[PDB]
Swiss-Prot record, chain A:
Assembly and oligomerization: Component of the HAUS augmin-like complex. The complex interacts with the gamma-tubulin ring complex and this interaction is required for spindle assembly.
Residue numbers of the full-length protein present here: 1 to 100 of 597
Disulfide bond annotation, renumbered to this chain: none
Protein name: HAUS augmin-like complex subunit 3
Function: Contributes to mitotic spindle assembly, maintenance of centrosome integrity and completion of cytokinesis as part of the HAUS augmin-like complex.
Native organism: Xenopus laevis (African clawed frog)
Length: 100, 103
């Protein structure tokens, strides 16, 4: 795999919308530049599918941020999301109608 | 002028968002060579959509949280219809128990 092949594969894993039309050989000149090679090798290793935020979630989070509602920090999110273990509580009142 | 601002945003994204140590970050003049031809649009997408795993969790879990909170408000209007149906069923049970007693 050339340096260009490896870059095009990382762009495909990152869901770049033109990633299927890119050929690997067209990018090999980026890896001939001795001084830029360490940064490109890092980018190709550090970026994964779990790092991608889709445009709808970015927009919805920006509207959440514009709505003036408080944005919970990571620890508060873990405490709230732990307490928000998916309690099948809608089943208890629905079971009261089914029993009746 | 545009290729210089994109070099700056990419350096900022690499150091602040993705956590690259600043001594390993190439110079802003070196980064400008990455915006030749079609590569300019590629790096714009990367800066906008690719976040740290920590930032992704904060975004997704706050969205999930407020979706669950709205689902609990919409559940109250369904609880009122369920309370009306429960009153209807309890009234029908009382009428049926009274008819059963008379039978």
């Amino acid at each position: 795999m050339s340096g260009g092949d490896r870059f095009v594969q990382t762009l495909q894993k990152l869901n770049y919308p033109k990633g299927a039309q890119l050929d690997g050989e067209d990018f090999d000149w980026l890896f001939e530049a001795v001084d830029l090679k360490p940064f490109l090798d890092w980018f190709c290793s550090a970026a994964s599918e779990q790092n991608v935020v889709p445009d709808e979630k970015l927009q919805a989070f920006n509207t959440l941020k514009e709505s003036g509602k408080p944005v919970l920090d990571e620890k508060a999110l873990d405490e709230v999301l732990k307490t928000f273990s998916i309690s099948k509580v809608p089943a208890i009142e629905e079971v009261a109608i089914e029993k009746l | 002028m545009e290729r210089r601002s994109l070099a700056q945003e990419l350096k900022k994204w690499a150091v602040e968002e993705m956590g690259l140590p600043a001594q390993k970050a190439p110079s802003e003049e070196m980064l400008q060579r990455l915006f030749i031809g079609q590569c300019g649009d590629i790096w714009k997408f990367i800066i906008r959509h690719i976040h740290s795993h920590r930032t992704v969790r904060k975004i997704e879990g706050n969205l999930l949280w407020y979706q669950q909170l709205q689902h609990t408000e919409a559940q109250r209007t369904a609880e009122e219809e369920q309370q009306q149906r429960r009153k209807q069923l309890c009234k029908e049970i009382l009428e049926l128990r009274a008819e059963l007693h008379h039978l």
